[PDB]
Structure 1
């Protein structure tokens, strides 16, 4: 990093630091040289044990953060690094050894640290040795402190300390229901974006109600992120990361206006966010970082959304756009699994036989809980990627994940413990209680493919291969051995529980499928075995 540079302020980190974006595109956290933000170090706060919120509980911290935010957010500042501390001595830091790049930050001729100090919103560090590194405008900082003292400002004031009371109904369903009608009736409410969870979900501060809420953008579907929950590991939807950054760079810590239309089961309010005359839902669609949802159809913003989506789709970009390690010995470790579903593209789902009892126990517990607390028919509008419970054709409830929301009557779900898919009406869906989520029992179904064989490209040929497998192993216990991973799901070999005959090899024997050769040494023998079968077919 250079000693001097001009950079754009992306976030105000409390009262003594900011995050800037360099011309190179990199982000840097910069602390203000020779000043300390207000801190509660030295005072007892047992009354706030594990409930202390620095922004609101530290004397003058809110005032300092707001002064900096209003003056700098989204602006270009002139920076000159004065010194670097290898490890901050502050009591609370993350991590325990945290470097601090300390600089003089100026804009329009105003030294930011000097301005904070003059208002008593920061204090000047005193140095024991004249050789200690300090701000290059140190004398000006001390002059500012004299003014703060003279005028009794901020931390130098003798007046009663200003108290800040801020309610927080973030992701709280019962509390959200209490506020919904009021927020809907208020029309456009002023708010400050405090956090951005993704391209479309944010945490907002509403000054008029001195309350914090979580908010989801209406009328669109924004790409979801990665997952690595128990039994569910996958990359995020395309451009989920860029969408988040788009929203962060545009609205983080900006004053915006929001219209609340409804709320979801998680306590998130759903509505429209307006920033400097623009509609965020429309902007995301315009930049091809989200798509229009059917909920937008009855909205006055529908035309703008369609126009944006039209231009985005024409560009055909963004949302509209394997060898393995060689090993000496081949795996060979067959374990009992229960094959539940065979897919049309010759893939299949299985459950671990060893945990079958755990799934049974969970289903009894969950279904008994559902029987006691029946989901309200039609009061649930699922969001893509959300977990839920779904009522299958057998009339029983199962854990599921929403994969696509076509309309209120057509919700595409995936039964996470079995592997089958179904299109159902929202009336046959309900919320999945935390007590029965993957936090308690992992998703039980795992997707696998046959190793060493090529899935027929010819529909009729593939259908015949699938029918054979369904007939031979669907809904039966088999032995499975993981051979290797792929760009998709893992490839395995299956053996019949009794004869222990290789299921995939059998498809080769019958001439239903061709062999897919692997180059890795561990498969030297098995590839010859498969190629021989193919020859004799």
Structure 2
């Protein structure tokens, strides 16, 4: 039964989260775990820190550059008693386009856990192995394990150190419409980035337009490559501004009635405090969302 969606995100082990379109509330999300294949677990924390396995980040990044935002179709081969769905995703509008699992195994960024589907995966794995790609390269793959830091040591120094020069980063999670979790590169600091000069509504049951603000920002920036101006800090959080070619998310959120200009932190906004007050004034005059009567 061929189903359809957009890629919301790609996870640890290249299980992919697929979403639909919303119809009164945020979109329905499904987490598909790729059938017949195995990729590494990414780094994670619990009792202790545990690092990236070999080749897990490069696998995640491969499907991320390739898939995020695109329209896929999928098919659910099984549903386990643990509450998980296994299946195959095809990057296109049909079950004969580009099987994403075949891309992984040909790059050597995954492996197999007879029939046409299983034959195609073999043909990919033999090629990858016979061209020394990914995990079939000479070595242990230690150069693919990120030196992942969960906290910045001296934050004021760290921000002062970059002199407001944008830092390439990946936006890994959206807590609410105005605070994100940003993977900074090339040092692999995973940290909390609050948008300088604004505040969206927030999750506790949630304030009006929190879920809407979260979605607005999340569908535009989750698992996208961005640059961040690190402007100041609040505790172990980075006050900053996000750059992307399509626009300024801070300037939009206010302009679209999803945010209010907060007085303290707007002093550190480098891109120009007049524009944030202007876009709020745009929303307020138009009676948009948080400004309705």
Structure 2 residue matching 1:319: 3-state secondary structure? helix
Change (3 A) 1:161 1:167: closer
CA distance change for structure 1 residues 225 and 23 in 2, over 3 Å: closer, same or farther? closer
* Cα deviation 1:314-364 (Å, max 9, x = unaligned): 34242112xxxxxxxxxxxxxxxxxxxxxxxxxxxxxxxxxxxxxxxxxxx
Kindly state the Cα deviation for residue 286 of structure 1 after the two structures are TM-superposed: 1.7
Q: What is residue 119 of structure 1 aligned with on the other side?
A: 107
Q: Is the 8 A contact 2:88 2:99 kept in 1?
A: no
Q: Does 1:244 align with 2:214?
A: yes
Q: Which residue of 1 aligns with 2:290?
A: 319
State the alpha-carbon separation in 2 of the partners of residues 169 and 82 from structure 1. 35
Tell me, in whole angstroms, the C-alpha distance in 2 between the residues paired with 1:162 and 1:49: 23
**Would the aligned equivalents of 2:167 and 2:227 in 1 still touch at CA under 8 Å?**
yes
CA contact (8 A) 2:256 2:288 kept: no
Q: TM-score under structure 1 normalisation?
A: 0.48
**Separation in structure 1 between the aligned mates of residue 149 and residue 158 of structure 2, nearest angstrom:** 11
Residues 114, 144 of structure 1: 8 Å contact kept? yes
For each residue in 1:108-152, what CA deviation from the matched residue of structure 2 results, as whole angstroms up to 9, or x when unmatched?
Answer: 943211010011111123xxxx6xxx8x73321111011122123
Deviation at 1:167, TM superposition (A): 4.1
Question: What are structure 2's unaligned runs of at least 5 residues?
Answer: none
Structure 1 match to 2:14: 16
Q: Tell me, yes or no, if the aligned pair for 1:82 and 1:104 is still in contact at 8 Å.
A: no
Preserved contact between residue 169 and residue 175 of structure 1 (Cα < 8 Å): no
> Is 2:59 the partner of 1:64?
yes
Q: Does 1:156 align with 2:136?
A: yes
Note if 1:105 corresponds to 2:90: yes
Who is 1:418 aligned against?
Answer: none
Q: Could you say if the C-alpha distance between residues 169 and 27 of structure 1 is closer, same or farther in structure 2, counting changes exceeding 3 Å?
A: closer
Q: CA deviation at 1:23?
A: 4.1
Paired positions, count: 279
Q: 1:182 aligns with which of 161, 170, 189?
A: 161
| Matching residue of 2:243 | 274
| Aligned partner of 2:197 among 216, 219, 244 | 219
Give the C-alpha shift of residue 177 in structure 1.
Answer: 2.8
1:204 corresponds in structure 2 to 182
Contact 1:288 1:319 in 2 (8 A): yes
Counterpart residue number, 1:141: 121
Aligned with 1:306 (options 264, 277, 280): 277
Aligned mates of 1:106, 1:299 — CA distance in 2: 39
List alignment gaps of at least 5 residues for structure 1: 41-47, 88-96, 227-234, 322-537
| 1:84 shift after superposition | 0.9
Pairing of 1:63-462 with structure 2 (within 5 A): 63-79=58-74, 81-87=75-81, 97-107=82-92, 109-125=97-113, 137-163=117-143, 164-170=145-151, 175-183=154-162, 185-226=163-204, 235-264=205-234, 266-294=235-263, 295-296=265-266, 300-321=271-292
CA RMSD in angstroms comes to 2.6
The TM-score, its normalising length taken from structure 2, stands at 0.85
How far did 1:39 drift? Answer: 5.5
> Per the alignment, in what secondary structure is the counterpart of residue 139 of structure 2?
coil
Distance 2:135 2:271 in 1: 49
Larger radius of gyration: 1
Highest RCO, 1 vs 2 (Cα 8 Å, sep ≥ 6): 2
Distance 1:261 1:23, change over 3 A: closer
Cα 1:23/1:201, change in 2 over 3 Å: closer
The CA distance in 2 between the partners of 1:296 and 1:177, in whole Å, is 17
Q: Deviations over 1:277-304 (max 9, x none)?
A: 4111111112211012334378543333
- Alignment counterpart, residue 36 of structure 1, candidates 35, 38, 41: 38
Q: Look up the SS of the partner of 2:49 in the other structure.
A: coil
Q: Matches of 1:290 and 1:49 in 2, distance apart?
A: 37
What is the CA distance between 1:85 and its match in structure 2? 3.5
| Counterparts in 2 of 1:177 and 1:307: CA distance versus 1, 3 Å | closer
Q: What secondary structure, in the 3-state scheme, does the structure 1 residue paired with 2:123 have?
A: helix
